[PDB]
Amino acid sequence: DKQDTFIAAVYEHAAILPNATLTPVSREEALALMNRNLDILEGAITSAADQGAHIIVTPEDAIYGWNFNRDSLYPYLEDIPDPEVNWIPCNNRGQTPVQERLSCLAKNNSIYVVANIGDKKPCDTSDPQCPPDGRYQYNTDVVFDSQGKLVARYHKQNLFMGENQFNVPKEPEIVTFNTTFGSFGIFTCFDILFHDPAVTLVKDFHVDTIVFPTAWMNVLPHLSAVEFHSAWAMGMRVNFLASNIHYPSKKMTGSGIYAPNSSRAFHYDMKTEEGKLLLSQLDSHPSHSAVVNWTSYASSIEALSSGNKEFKGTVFFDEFTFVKLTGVAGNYTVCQKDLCCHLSYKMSENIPNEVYALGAFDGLHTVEGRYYLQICTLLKCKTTNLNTCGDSAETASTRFEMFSLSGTFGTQYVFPEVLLSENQLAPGEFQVSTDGRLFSLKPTSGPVLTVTLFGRLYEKD
Numbered sequence: 459d460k461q462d463t464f465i466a467a468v469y470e471h472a473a474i475l476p477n478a479t480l481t482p483v484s485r486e487e488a489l490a491l492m493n494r495n496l497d498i499l500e501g502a503i504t505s506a507a508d509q510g511a512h513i514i515v516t517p518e519d520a521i522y523g524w525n526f527n528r529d530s531l532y533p534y535l536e537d538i539p540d541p542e543v544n545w546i547p548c549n550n551r552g553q554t555p556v557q558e559r560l561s562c563l564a565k566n567n568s569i570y571v572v573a574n575i576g577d578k579k580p581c582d583t584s585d586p587q588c589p590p591d592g593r594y595q596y597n598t599d600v601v602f603d604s605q606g607k608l609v610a611r612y613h614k615q616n617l618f619m620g621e622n623q624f625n626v627p628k629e630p631e632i633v634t635f636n637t638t639f640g641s642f643g644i645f646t647c648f649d650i651l652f653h654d655p656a657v658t659l660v661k662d663f664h665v666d667t668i669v670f671p672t673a674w675m676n677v678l679p680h681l682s683a684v685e686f687h688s689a690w691a692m693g694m695r696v697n698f699l700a701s702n703i704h705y706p707s708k709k710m711t712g713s714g715i716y717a718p719n720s721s722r723a724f725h726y727d728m729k730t731e732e733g734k735l736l737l738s739q740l741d742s743h744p745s746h747s748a749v750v751n752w753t754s755y756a757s758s759i760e761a762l763s764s765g766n767k768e769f770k771g772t773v774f775f776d777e778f779t780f781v782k783l784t785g786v787a788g789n790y791t792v793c794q795k796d797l798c799c800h801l802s803y804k805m806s807e808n809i810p811n812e813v814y815a816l817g818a819f820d821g822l823h824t825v826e827g828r829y830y831l832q833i834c835t836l837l838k839c840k841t842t843n844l845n846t847c848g849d850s851a852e853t854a855s856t857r858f859e860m861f862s863l864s865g866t867f868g869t870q871y872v873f874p875e876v877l878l879s880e881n882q883l884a885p886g887e888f889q890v891s892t893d894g895r896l897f898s899l900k901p902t903s904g905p906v907l908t909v910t911l912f913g914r915l916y917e918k919d
């Protein structure tokens with residue numbers, strides 16, 4: 459009974475956290491908490507369904523929060539079976555009340571629900587990987603169809619540092635589920651930065667859409683949630699439904715609905731403590747650019763400047779090679795090892811006290827994650843001191859008339875980011891060519907913070 463379009467929802471949830479204790483709570487108390495969160499999510503699910511939604515994603519850790527060790531978490535966990543068990547928790551019919559409730563919300567509102575809860579998998583002592591305390595504990599995405607049937611279960615593969623209360627699956631779980639409105643894949647938060655499963659789902663299973671529960675700490679200039687999540691969508695050419703936690707206190711905010719060509723809806727709010735429901739109609743099999751050769755253009759030309767005054771700047775603990783942008787227009791090129799970044803630009807006007815720089819990085823990131831990068835970035839320097847180029851910067855005043863950025867990337871996996879002052883996306887104000895140029899389509903609707911090509915060489919990790 460296939461459909462050409464569908465309405466997506468994502469909910470940015472202000473989580474109710476458990477009270478702290480020095481000793482593990484009872485299963486009855488842990489449920490109490492989870493139900494209070496569930497009461498809220500029910501609000502979002504009811505509303506979204508009442509607005510035509512076919513699926514809704516809720517965030518990671520949205521039901522019990524993120525402050526845990528292995529034991530304090532345990533009473534919140536449930537044993538979550540393989541969808542292949544072929545089971546509708548609402549109907550049948552106890553020891554899995556969270557799953558029952560989720561299944562009922564999906565059924566009573568006739569809507570796919572996607573949530574993050576915790577799975578426990580008690581293991582045998584024969585299993586050499588079995589933890590001393592007798593069980594695996596996984597961070598677990600679950601999906602329920604509009605019948606309430608469990609159709610997907612993904613265990614998070616790439617844990618962030620601090621997630622000591624969870625285990626890493628022995629093997630990467632490549633999890634999909636199909637619908638009348640397309641083929642979906644799923645992964646969680648920090649997974650987006652790695653090859654398994656996120657890349658494989660797209661490259662090898664050809665999913666139309668990704669659902670993506672998350673709790674994401676915003677790190678400028680390149681990893682604000684909305685900024686990076688939408689760029690991934692665009693780079694991998696998929697619909698992308700990012701449901702983030704709302705917790706400004708920890709720089710967590712940035713949910714949205716992204717299509718290959720543009721953001722469709724986004725929310726970023728650091729000023730209040732209320733959550734947010736987003737909606738947008740999408741195409742089941744979404745329209746996208748044909749395959750991009752990212753090095754094609756940048757390798758066909760000679761350097762746009764030389765005798766450069768280059769310098770080192772620290773962008774998120776990585777040492778880039780920069781060059782100041784002097785004119786109100788200009789063309790520059792900057793290299794580092796195998797990467798050459800080419801920028802042509804023209805500003806709307808020169809804001810006197812705002813410096814921009816074009817930067818190149820080719821190397822291994824190591825802080826709070828070990829992964830290999832290649833990056834071209836135009837960015838606004840925090841201050842007029844060039845030692846601050848690469849440091850986090852909230853706001854700007856310099857609009858741009860045009861830009862065109864490209865690099866000699868040795869990866870086919872590059873993600874085009876653009877971010878405007880006050881952490882605003884620039885939907886449909888740019889596009890990517892077949893040969894790897896990221897170029898403006900018009901004058902920017904606001905001041906620019908960065909325009910970046912975020913490359914990623916998964917093998918060199």
Ligand SMILES: *[C@@H]1O[C@H](CO)[C@@H](O[C@@H]2O[C@H](CO)[C@@H](O)[C@H](O)[C@H]2NC(C)=O)[C@H](O)[C@H]1NC(C)=O
Pocket residue numbers: 634635636641662663664
């Ligand atoms: C619906 O999704 C299923 C996955 O359940 C798709 O089947 C996979 O297709 C990929 C890519 O063609 C194959 O490499 C896999 O072998 C298939 N599944 C598995 C589990 O390995 C199916 O193509 C989708 N339905 C369509 C296109 O109508």
Ligand SMILES: *[C@@H]1O[C@H](CO)[C@@H](O)[C@H](O)[C@H]1NC(C)=O
Pocket residue numbers: 548562563566
């Ligand atoms: C949901 O559906 C079940 C089906 O039996 C119904 O009995 C229950 O009262 C409903 N609960 C909610 C929260 O809608």
Ligand SMILES: *[C@@H]1O[C@H](CO)[C@@H](O)[C@H](O)[C@H]1NC(C)=O
Pocket residue numbers: 751752753754755757758
């Ligand atoms: C991209 O273009 C370059 C020439 O600029 C070529 O050598 C390279 O093989 C191309 N890559 C692909 C995947 O077509």
Ligand SMILES: *[C@@H]1O[C@H](CO)[C@@H](O)[C@H](O)[C@H]1NC(C)=O
Pocket residue numbers: 762787788789802
């Ligand atoms: C470089 O920029 C100048 C203006 O600064 C422009 O006229 C020229 O055509 C550009 N060359 C390119 C993009 O190769």
Ligand SMILES: *[C@H]1O[C@H](CO)[C@@H](O)[C@H](O)[C@H]1NC(C)=O
Pocket residue numbers: 477
């Ligand atoms: C935690 O929960 C109890 C009720 O279960 C509430 O009355 C109390 O105020 C809360 N504790 C703190 C420190 O806020």
